[PDB]
Amino acid sequence: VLSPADKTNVKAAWGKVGAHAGEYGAEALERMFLSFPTTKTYFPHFDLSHGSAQVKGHGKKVADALTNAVAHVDDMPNALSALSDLHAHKLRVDPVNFKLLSHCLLVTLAAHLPAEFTPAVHASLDKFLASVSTVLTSKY
Amino acid sequence: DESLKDAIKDPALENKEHDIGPREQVNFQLLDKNNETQYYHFFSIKDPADVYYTKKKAEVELDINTASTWKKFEVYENNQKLPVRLVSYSPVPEDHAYIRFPVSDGTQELKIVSSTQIDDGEETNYDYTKLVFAKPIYNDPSL
Numbered sequence A: 001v002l003s004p005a006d007k008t009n010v011k012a013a014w015g016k017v018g019a020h021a022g023e024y025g026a027e028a029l030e031r032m033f034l035s036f037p038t039t040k041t042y043f044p045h046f047d048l049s050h051g052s053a054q055v056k057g058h059g060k061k062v063a064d065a066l067t068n069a070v071a072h073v074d075d076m077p078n079a080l081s082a083l084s085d086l087h088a089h090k091l092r093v094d095p096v097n098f099k100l101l102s103h104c105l106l107v108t109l110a111a112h113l114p115a116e117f118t119p120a121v122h123a124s125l126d127k128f129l130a131s132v133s134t135v136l137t138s139k140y
Numbered sequence B: 001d002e003s004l005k006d007a008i009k010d011p012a013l014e015n016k017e018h019d020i021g022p023r024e025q026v027n028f029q030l031l032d033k034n035n036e037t038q039y040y041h042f043f044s045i046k047d048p049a050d051v052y053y054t055k056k057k058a059e060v061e062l063d064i065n066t067a068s069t070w071k072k073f074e075v076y077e078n079n080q081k082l083p084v085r086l087v088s089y090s091p092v093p094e095d096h097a098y099i100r101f102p103v104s105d106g107t108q109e110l111k112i113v114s115s116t117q118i119d120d121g122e123e124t125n126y127d128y129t130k131l132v133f134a135k136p137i138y139n140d141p142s143l
Ligand code: HEM
Pocket: A039, A042, A043, A061, A062, A065, A066, A083, A087, A091, A093, A097, A098, A101, A102, A133
């Protein structure tokens, strides 16, 4: 499903994000909880206020996971093995929540990098985030 | 002129063997002009690289993914163009291009001038990428 063209756009887009990946990851979470309050059920004992240490910390861990997924895009299921067990088996997260997270992430990337966020790159990122969502929501 | 897009089209290297002989794993970093992480290459080039020993000079093998998009890929040693050659290629969806080139003893960092292109659109040039090995390379004839 992910073509060579899609993989090229993912690396380039996530590459131009680079150092600010952890910042956009945290921003995407804060944008998700405010927009979709049903997402907060998975984080009961968490500080979900504006400029929280937990959200900034968790956003970095999500960004590092995405960076790991981008680096090993040709073999995602093996790369995100532990996270698949965590989200699918243990947490039992509904796949619908991943569409809401990626929605907020793509909006964040569009804001901070307008010129770089072309329709072709936008298509590839959504296609990339969809495939990473299927790996995490699936059981092995 | 000898781009990876067209180089991988040779069916002789459809899945050719390239792991025979003595080698050593060598870690490295891919940095830009400002000595900061060159991200596109970081995601593309596999770390650590295999360094195959020979009788004369050690040949470093670089595993480059999404070869179908990679156009230009020139490697320089102290501002001198090294002879790069395609040894093997994994087809899509893997799309990995394995290329080898010789490196003289004591060489710790190399200069990589390269470019990418999707089918026939905007050619994204990468004028300077700095490959820096964790240790200098040294060939071992005794293996
Ligand atoms: C972009 C897709 C996602 C990625 C890459 C991702 C990644 C991660 C990572 C790396 C961790 C480990 C954090 C740690 O070690 O403490 C984690 C934890 C967690 N994730 Fe996700 N996640 C994603 C989407 C979601 C979604 C949609 C939900 C549900 C709303 C969710 C809920 C959780 C929960 C409840 C934890 C455990 C929190 C804790 O106790 O530390 N994740 N995630």
